[PDB]
Amino acid sequence: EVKILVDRDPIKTSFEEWAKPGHFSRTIAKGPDTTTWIWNLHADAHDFDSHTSDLEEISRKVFSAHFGQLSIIFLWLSGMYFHGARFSNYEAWLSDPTHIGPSAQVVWSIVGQEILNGDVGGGFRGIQITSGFFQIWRASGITSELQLYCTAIGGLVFAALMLFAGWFHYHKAAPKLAWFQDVESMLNHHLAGLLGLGSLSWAGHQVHVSLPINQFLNAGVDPKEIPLPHEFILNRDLLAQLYPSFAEGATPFFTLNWSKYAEFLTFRGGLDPVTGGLWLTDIAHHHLAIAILFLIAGHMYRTNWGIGHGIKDILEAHKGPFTGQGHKGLYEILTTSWHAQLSINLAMLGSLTIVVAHHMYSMPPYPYLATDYGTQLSLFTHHMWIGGFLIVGAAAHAAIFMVRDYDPTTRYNDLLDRVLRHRDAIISHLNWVCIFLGFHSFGLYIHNDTMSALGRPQDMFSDTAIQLQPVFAQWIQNTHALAPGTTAPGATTSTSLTWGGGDLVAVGGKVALLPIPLGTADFLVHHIHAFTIHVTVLILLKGVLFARSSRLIPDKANLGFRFPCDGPGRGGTCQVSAWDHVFLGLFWMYNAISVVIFHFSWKMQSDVWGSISDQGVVTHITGGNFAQSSITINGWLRDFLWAQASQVIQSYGSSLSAYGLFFLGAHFVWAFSLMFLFSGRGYWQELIESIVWAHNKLKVAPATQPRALSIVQGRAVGVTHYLLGGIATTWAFFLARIIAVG
């Protein structure tokens, strides 16, 4: 049954292996004859599946790598906390948050870079930060620096503990294979233990520490006069004065009359007027409910006892109209190969990150976060980029599994075979829908441009000539506006202010949130989003499905997952491996994410953000020209790229010069990438031949003969440089513009 199984000292810690490189693979271990050897030593460093074949060693290596990664993350967190404690102006920002810019980095005075120490405010000079850490610390209840120092020390200690644990589990006591394959216990502990207890404990902290300190802060008291958090725990009088319910203690909870706790566990919803964030009582209530739900749901699978459920029984016994026998051999597939689990987890994490970004810009969960425009922009863009990258990687790992871990003899699955047997219909229909969507979505813009250039503004697809309104979205907005009165009797207001109707919420003369209207431009942009998403899905799905074999190459599995081509014959067979399909899909993911972030930035700068006056009128940043100027490509090039780049390029001689320097550097790297993307290997090898002759003429030729990069390495270098250049350009442009004008 379920038990702990370990092996004692599988490997011995010794420096002998460090002396010689490439010990994992024999062909690497032989010795270097050409430079290519070096480039291989890094390519197969983490290819644990190809070093050996036993599952036990792979699992142990995976565990140790996870521990190392956790240690690195803890070290990074400790460094951030120590920087916040030592070189920062947190205490100044605490008293006057609206007129002080956060900053936690100070530049030395070595060469002339001291001009980077801009005057953020509050008697401090330093680089303004846009990580949103200050809002997190304020919402946590931290009001000093000693607490931050203690947190940093604890983080360092935790990093050391994680490193020791990784070493101990790889070199002293290594879990056996049967320990890993016990997924029922893993799921039970991950649901009930990690997600339930953690959120319950955080709810306890929020109820006991964050709520009273934040109440005192919002009441207008000076930060240096607020009582320390432990005084609230020790003294019941202070809590009773702040909340009378605590005077009754824990008696009501055991008596099931929970309404007595309605003082600090509410259901109002909406945004708090003082700070423009969600009510902390609602957040604590939500955390408590989530804890209860997760603790309940973590006791579903049978482990070592009579009660519970079996995953294999659930999968096998499920009979449906469309599936049939269906899920039969999926349990072995998902418990035998690591790559399938990696693919599913990567897809789920990417989707979760994107949803996180959307929900976080929609409803600000931290105090004084909505009015900080740079923080919002940075958080949204960063999280969406991360989600896109993870979603892309999922397909690559699925292709790896399909290539090297799929055999129909020992493990057979009906649904997978049924999907494989009719791939042509899937690909054909996906291709047709992609063509149709792209044709319509881009033809609308081209038609708008052409009718504009000919002096025919009455034949456009616009808000005045021919209208295409998103009626369904408007209906949903109206239903959500009307919901709190009838559909949600408990909720006092709307879940978020984004839905049409309601009132503007502004903090300190700056607009925090107001309803976002939808028109023709939103229709067109959403259809463009759908088109790009569909094309990326088509590329990745084709790469995954046609990995094992194709009509052109009937034996593509033998060649492997990473092979440049098959030869000049058959008319040319370049880029048929699934790796090349991933390399092609990266560009389209980049395109889609760039378009989406551009849309979000322009819409927010045009129709939401701005300034409010004493009289009551609202003046937006760009004057609300998105509704009429974004229906043509000329409008996107002139009113958005040309107009908003003034702050980036005219930042020389000021405290934002680094942004312009990075703006130029990203352009240089993007132009550099085309050198690898466009050319071929033979020319470079033939040039290196003459260079090597010139070297040998002077008796300075090396023993490791130079060799041009392989084809796959060239493509990888090209795509890496391209992505880095584009992302850095967008980063510099966004940050400079939103810091200057926001």
């Binding site: 070189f87 100044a92 100070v106 008697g123 401090f124």
Partner: peptide, 11 residues
């Protein structure tokens, strides 16, 4: 806040 900035310029 002044001391934090001065920590960089001690030398």
């Amino acid at each position: 806040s002044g001391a934090n900035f001065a920590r960089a310029f001690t030398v």
